[PDB]
Amino acid sequence: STGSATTTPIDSLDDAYITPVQIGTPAQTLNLDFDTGSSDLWVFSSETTASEVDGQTIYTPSKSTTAKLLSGATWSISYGDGSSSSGDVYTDTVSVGGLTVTGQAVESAKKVSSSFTEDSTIDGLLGLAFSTLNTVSPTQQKTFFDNAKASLDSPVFTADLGYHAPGTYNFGFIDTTAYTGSITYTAVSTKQGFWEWTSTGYAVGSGTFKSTSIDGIADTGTTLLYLPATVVSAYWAQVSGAKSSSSVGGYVFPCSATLPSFTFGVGSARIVIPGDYIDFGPISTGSSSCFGGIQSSAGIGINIFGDVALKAAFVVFNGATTPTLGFASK
Structure with missing residues (x-):
């Protein structure tokens, strides 16, 4: 079926x-x-x-x-x-x-x-x-x-x-018509009960790719992308006027900004999140301060590839005897 x-x-x-x-x-x-x-x-x-x-x-x-x-x-x-x-x-x-x-x-x-x-x-x-x-x-x-x-x-x-x-x-x-190129599959640990995997790194905008292992979960029920503080700081540093706000509860940026893309690695493959995907709009109605879609996972205890990341891809949740995750561009 x-x-x-x-x-x-x-x-x-x-x-x-x-x-x-x-x-x-x-x-x-x-x-x-x-x-x-x-x-x-x-x-x-x-x-x-x-x-x-x-x-x-x-x-x-x-x-x-x-x-x-x-x-x-x-x-x-x-x-x-x-x-x-x-x-x-x-x-x-x-x-x-x-x-x-x-x-x-x-x-x-x-x-x-x-x-x-x-x-x-x-x-x-x-x-x-x-x-x-x-x-x-x-x-x-x-x-x-x-x-x-x-x-x-x-x-x-x-x-x-x-x-x-x-x-x-x-x-x-x-559905082989729903994505472009091929699906890259990557290992999953089920030890914490999640679809937990390890990204091979990231890039900010047109910047060079940084190879570094990022363990996290593929989580359709979380809105944003939560990554280590070093990564998140590197992203927001490319947005003039962006800052981490303790009172708001994360990185905010001028609503007038054009956001850079964010790329994450899946094995040797690369998923590109367009900048517009990272804009979550005014912090409060009428504000010109906007909430960022990439935030620090520090104090969560786990990195979370939420909707911001997943919506940039076609994602296979493979429940074979040994589960794996697949990602394709689309």
């Missing part, structure tokens, strides 16, 4: 991407944030504290004839950005772009933190990291991809995120 779904930016800045997902019988369609940095499929629901729902579409398991309460199971997750959610668990039928999993764990939120409530466009998350990170207790549950894998034509999914435009998540096949 295969599946194919369009993923759409939630706003004009590409702050995140939502993909429609069918849950239950009859189908209840929710718009979920596909997140290769976590491993829980959780949704706003009829069980979510009413004051914490503000415009999201909810899953109502009592209206699904295939929903079953997973007895005694709870979940609770805290994300790197400080947000969190928790609740109980159903199994139900979940379909993405034509691909169907029966008996998928659907984690129903009883509580969500303020940032989730405040974002009316995201009805939940669909985790696509390794199932070892899944928070369900006392019996850990598998991700949608893990459940589908054996049925897929090929045990892979691909992320093709758009810049200020829709893109595609495909399951079970590689």
Whole structure:
């Protein structure tokens, strides 16, 4: 089998991407944030504290004839950005772009933190990291991809995120029309439960490529590109007036600037992030200070190849017996 779904930016800045997902019988369609940095499929629901729902579409398991309460199971997750959610668990039928999993764990939120409530466009998350990170207790549950894998034509999914435009998540096949050149594959460590790999270096604008190993995660659920302070300083040094602002919480730059590109290495291959991808707009409405899309990972504890990086590429998440990651230009 295969599946194919369009993923759409939630706003004009590409702050995140939502993909429609069918849950239950009859189908209840929710718009979920596909997140290769976590491993829980959780949704706003009829069980979510009413004051914490503000415009999201909810899953109502009592209206699904295939929903079953997973007895005694709870979940609770805290994300790197400080947000969190928790609740109980159903199994139900979940379909993405034509691909169907029966008996998928659907984690129903009883509580969500303020940032989730405040974002009316995201009805939940669909985790696509390794199932070892899944928070369900006392019996850990598998991700949608893990459940589908054996049925897929090929045990892979691909992320093709758009810049200020829709893109595609495909399951079970590689669309050879969706990228240019070849796909360069690179090793993955699953030891921390992430799609963790090592970039071979970087360049700023038309500058020379610096060969240096950068360990990080391919994370569709993180907006920005988080890299070591040395790298980030080298980038922003090429932008007149850019500075790290403690009060704002990262590098800011004059909105009048034209940003240089940023290149990262995948083996001997090179992915070029155009400068415009690195502009996240005014820090506050009406400001002429703009927020940068490349930020320091110091104090995160891990480098993160988030959407800023991934959207410059066609990305293969290869779930073969030994997982690997593939990147192509597009």
